[PDB]
Each structure stands twice: as structure tokens, then as C-alpha cells.
Design a protein around this ligand. Sequence first.
Ligand SMILES: [Cl-]
Ligand SMILES: [Cl-]
Ligand SMILES: [Cl-]
Ligand SMILES: [Cl-]
Ligand SMILES: [Cl-]
Ligand SMILES: [Cl-]
Ligand SMILES: [Cl-]
Ligand SMILES: [Cl-]
Length: 128
Amino acid sequence: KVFGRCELAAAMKRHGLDNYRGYSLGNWVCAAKFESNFNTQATNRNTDGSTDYGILQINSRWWCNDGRTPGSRNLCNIPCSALLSSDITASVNCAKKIVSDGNGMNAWVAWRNRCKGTDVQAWIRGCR
Ligand SMILES: [Cl-]
Ligand SMILES: [Cl-]
Ligand SMILES: [Cl-]
Ligand SMILES: [Cl-]
Ligand SMILES: [Cl-]
Ligand SMILES: [Cl-]
Ligand SMILES: [Cl-]
Ligand SMILES: [Cl-]
């Protein structure tokens, strides 16, 4: 599923992600835009052989199991395919774990490089 901007803001809020760990909703929408272009089915292989899955590009090196990332953990206790569903619940639950891990949203290097410090409220501007 490819979400629209306000549609994804509303789904993130309904799953408790707004102001989670202090990160306003615009930060989470901005991160999703640049990680996946709002596409739940996005996947991207990393040079190390892990893969990033779903609308927040959760990495199989730590967070989910895809059966092909040797030496990697599954700290969200979830198959990485669960992170590609139209329903964003599994991605949001796993994002809550990640953002609690010590470095906040810096875990998402697109957030750090493209969202951090910017006017992230523009991402929710106009949304009901
Ligand atoms: Cl957009
Ligand atoms: Cl915001
Ligand atoms: Cl992989
Ligand atoms: Cl997803
Ligand atoms: Cl694996
Ligand atoms: Cl392994
Ligand atoms: Cl959803
Ligand atoms: Cl980047």
C-alpha cells in the first residue's frame, strides 16, 4: 500500500506513535517519506547483506528475521515479511523498540540526514 501523507499521519497517531519518545508526528511522517516514499512494500538490500523492510525500512541485522542475514538478531520477534503489510501495526511496534534503543531517531540515517532539525510540522500541515 502507498499511503498518502495525511493518511499515514492518521494511522501513526492511531497506533500511538505521535510524541512517542518525544518525537512529534511530523518526525515520523518525514522519516517514512524518505525511507520508503510511504510504500509499505519497500525493501532495500544493504551492502552488508541485511535488508531493510517496510514503510520505516527496519533492518534485518537487528530487528526482524528474514532467514538470510547470518549473525543477525530478531529483537522485534517478527518475520521481516510482517513489516510489508498494508496494516502498519508491526512496523510501528518495532519502531517503538528501535527509538527506545539509546540513539532515538538517529537510528534512521535518512531521518538524521533529511529530517532532523528541519520544519517537520510541514509534514502534518493541513491534516485532520
Ligand atoms: Cl508527500
Ligand atoms: Cl510535528
Ligand atoms: Cl537480507
Ligand atoms: Cl511497512
Ligand atoms: Cl538470518
Ligand atoms: Cl545467523
Ligand atoms: Cl494501518
Ligand atoms: Cl540519507
